[model samples]
Target: SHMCDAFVGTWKLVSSENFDDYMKEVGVGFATRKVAGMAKPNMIISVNGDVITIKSESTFKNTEISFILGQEFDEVTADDRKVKSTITLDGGVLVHVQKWDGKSTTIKRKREDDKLVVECVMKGVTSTRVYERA
Candidate 1:
């Protein structure tokens, strides 16, 4: 349950390209989207026993999400969508899948050298956000 060795770290956002498209796909409005657009959210990751907690922190808003491997749970996205989400460890990357309204999205988080790569795909749009160790 505690095989998340490489994921335990604090990462600062270097840049987030194509993030606006993802926000739009997730139904985020223009006002809220504007706030998130200029924000640099840090990815704070930690694993304990069987639960993994991910805290996305920024000056605009901070979101805390937690899940166990192989278990599905209710979750609310940053854009305020209710869905069933699950997180799993595949090979070395942390794979997260969220399903809602027949639409689904996947976010894969992995460390490449000293940078943390967060790749997201929703409705055919793919976005990559890279973070560096803090």
Candidate 2:
């Protein structure tokens, strides 16, 4: 309900931990992994009706993703993996899951005061990213 509005704002990256390992576990090469894991990344989230759109922006690459709640769709990730993806909000947390070629990743987002916390897990590697209101 009103909680959805908390996600509809631009967030600036504050800190990220274990992202390199998370990227490597997901099959990313050293260069691409370094480019992203070493830099701060921003994400913009918007909601319209039942549709939510998220844009991850960084100096290396920018990705835009949109989906309806509880709807599964084919999605090609930024690193070029075709996956079945779905996004859902449970309680106050937004959960995103993607699976492809026997590999899977899950990302959870939640608002904590002025910070947006994102936790991503893939192949047993977990990354925690924090973003402040922008």
Candidate 3:
């Protein structure tokens, strides 16, 4: 349950590429999409017993989610979609899967040197966002 202890820390967004395109593929509208694109969010990860919490803190909107590995839970996206989400620790990467309305997406977060690298995939498009430990 506490196997993901390595990720317990606060991370600030460093660089993000292709984020707007990723949002579009994920069904975000134009107005909200641009707002999200310009925002730099801090990712706060922590754990208590078997449950891990991930918080996205930003000026536009803040979102937080908690879950145990391999368990599916209800989630509402910042773009306003209700979905079933599951998070699993695979080797050293945190793999997150979200499904809604027959559509699915995957986000993989891993440590790269002193940074956290997140790769998001939807359809055939992939976007990468990097974060530095804060």
Itemize residue pairs with steric clashes in candidate 1.
Answer: none
**Where is model 2 more than 4 Å wrong at Cα?**
1-3
Q: Candidate 2's residue-wise lDDT over 14-107, tens digit each?
A: 9888988889889988887877776676899988877788998888778888888899988877677798999888998999999888878999
Q: What lDDT tens digits, residue by residue, belong to model 3 across residues 7-101?
A: 88999999999998899899999999989898999999999999999999999789999999999999999888999999988998999999999
Residue pairs with backbone overlap in model 3: none
Local accuracy by lDDT, each model: 0.88, 0.87, 0.93
**TM-score for predicted model 1 compared with the true structure:** 0.93
Q: lDDT: which candidate is best?
A: 3
Candidate 1 lDDT, 47-103, residue by residue in tens: 888889999998987899888898999988777889999888899888999999898
| Model 2 TM-score, all chains together | 0.93
Error of 2 at 64 (Å): 0.6
Global Cα lDDT for candidate 1: 0.88
Q: What is the lDDT of candidate 2?
A: 0.87
Weakest lDDT window of 10 consecutive positions for candidate 1: 1-10
Rate residue 73 of model 2 by lDDT: 84
Candidate that scores best on TM-score: 3
Clashes of 2: 0
In angstroms, the error of model 2 at 132 is 0.4
